Design an enzyme around this catalytic site. Structure first.
Site, short mmCIF file in Angstrom:
data_model
loop_
_atom_site.label_atom_id
_atom_site.label_comp_id
_atom_site.label_asym_id
_atom_site.label_seq_id
_atom_site.Cartn_x
_atom_site.Cartn_y
_atom_site.Cartn_z
N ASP A 170 -8.98 -2.83 14.47
CA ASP A 170 -7.73 -3.58 14.52
C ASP A 170 -6.90 -3.27 15.76
O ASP A 170 -5.73 -2.89 15.67
CB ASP A 170 -6.89 -3.33 13.26
CG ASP A 170 -5.92 -4.48 12.97
OD1 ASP A 170 -5.49 -4.62 11.80
OD2 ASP A 170 -5.59 -5.25 13.90
N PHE A 213 0.83 -1.19 0.00
CA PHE A 213 0.00 0.00 0.00
C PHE A 213 0.87 1.25 0.00
O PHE A 213 1.09 1.87 -1.05
CB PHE A 213 -0.91 0.01 1.23
#
Ligand SMILES: O=C1CCc2c(Oc3ccc4c(c3)[C@@H]3[C@H](O4)[C@H]3c3nc4cc(C(F)(F)F)ccc4[nH]3)ccnc2N1
Length: 253
Positions: A128, A20
């Site tokens: 997360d 990413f």
């Protein structure tokens, strides 16, 4: 406005590289940390992968959240935060033999409580929470953020019931697993040696953390709050104001 004009930020050393993006340590009125996107012209899908992350960031102003400082648009999209120094809680507990003391384990649990408490009031679901997403700045100050995983996923999240299973209680369950790490010393499912085994067994409730592995001087309050956070049904888990209260009450010893 929080937009940082081009050329103001001297992008220094690269810290981590992902498919990413890429996290550089930078300089802007002192040491900072910039997270850039490795694409020249970003698709609208990822355009507001950046616009959204920004929004949820500029809504935070807490000691135990990573400090947002601004964002660049050119030449590539970039988030700018404060520069933390040290290791994550994960590095400390599992990768290094950090001789942590009980008072400080509680304090880390307490700071994380305060931090997660603050997110929820702002109606922010992390999605997360884990030991390596919790940075120990100066090995003291806890900074919560996204520094990058099934071990912290609640049973209903492992099943992916409907679309989004991610909720306030999913973060609560994850928080328990962080308490598990602090209170035992190791990760859960230490003996199970297959990722696909953990996914299947937790998905049917046939597997859960071994609570008989905690330290002896683990306070009984904390032993039970840990259990409460790990209730298999989402609606049986305690909310963070309950949690913050309980932890802070025992921390005053
Ligand atoms: O040694 C190191 C390297 C990693 C690092 C840093 O890495 C980053 C640099 C920039 C950056 C990030 C992490 C992620 C994005 O931008 C920061 C971020 N914080 C967030 C907080 C949230 C939440 F808290 F949930 F609201 C959500 C998404 C988030 N994203 C920053 C500061 N210190 C250190 N320490």
């Amino acid at each position: 406005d929080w937009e940082i004009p081009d050329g103001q930020i001297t992008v220094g050393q690269r810290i981590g590289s992902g498919s990413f993006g890429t996290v550089y340590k930078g300089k802007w009125h002192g040491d900072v940390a910039v997270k850039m996107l490795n694409v020249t012209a970003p698709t609208p899908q990822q355009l507001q992968a950046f616009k959204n992350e920004v929004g949820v960031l500029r809504k935070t102003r807490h000691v135990n959240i990573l400090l947002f400082m601004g964002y660049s648009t050119k030449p590539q999209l970039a988030i700018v935060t404060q520069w933390c120094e040290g290791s994550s809680l994960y590095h400390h507990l599992h990768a290094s033999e950090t001789k942590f003391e009980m008072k400080k384990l509680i304090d880390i649990a307490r700071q994380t409580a305060r931090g997660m408490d603050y997110l929820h009031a702002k109606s922010i679901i992390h999605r997360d929470l884990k030991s390596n997403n919790i940075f120990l700045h100066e090995d003291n100050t806890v900074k919560i953020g996204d520094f990058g995983s099934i071990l912290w996923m609640a049973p209903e999240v492992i099943r992916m019931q409907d679309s989004n299973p991610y909720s306030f209680q999913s973060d609560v369950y994850a928080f328990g697993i962080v308490l598990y790490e602090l209170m035992t010393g190791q990760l859960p499912y230490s003996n199970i040696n297959n990722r696909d085994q953990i996914i299947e067994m937790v998905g049917r409730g046939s597997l859960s953390p071994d609570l008989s592995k905690v330290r002896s001087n683990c306070p009984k309050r904390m032993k039970r709050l840990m259990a409460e956070c790990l209730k298999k049904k989402r609606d049986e888990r305690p909310s963070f104001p309950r949690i913050l209260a309980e932890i802070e009450e025992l921390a005053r010893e």
